[PDB]
């Protein structure tokens, strides 16, 4: 039963990760500077899925 829950949980993590990719991509375009974009990467340095 736990394995079935894991698969359902696996889809939820992927949905969470897909949203993060979109928000992260929008932020990188928005800064418009190498220093600004780099700062965002440092914040999400440990958040990469």
């Amino acid at each position: 039963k736990f394995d079935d829950d894991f698969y359902e949980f696996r889809s939820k993590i992927k949905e969470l990760e897909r949203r993060l990719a979109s928000v992260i991509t929008q932020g990188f375009d928005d800064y418009d500077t190498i220093y600004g974009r780099f700062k965002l990467l440092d914040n999400f340095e440990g958040l990469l899925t």
């Binding site: 440092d42 914040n43 340095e45 440990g46």
Partner: protein, 50 residues
């Protein structure tokens, strides 16, 4: 970001402290000593029925 930067400095220290040169070799020597002691005990165990 400063807190994240602080963690990275700690990360270099954790690897330098926890991981050392020939760490596995020291562990292997300890394992060999345990194996030799176990071998002596097994011979004694074999002796009791005989």
């Amino acid at each position: 970001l400063e807190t994240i930067k602080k963690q990275q400095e700690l990360a270099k220290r954790q690897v330098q402290k926890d991981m050392g040169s020939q760490k596995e070799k020291w562990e292997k020597k300890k394992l060999e000593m345990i194996e030799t002691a176990e071998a002596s005990f097994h011979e004694n165990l074999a002796k009791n029925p005989v």
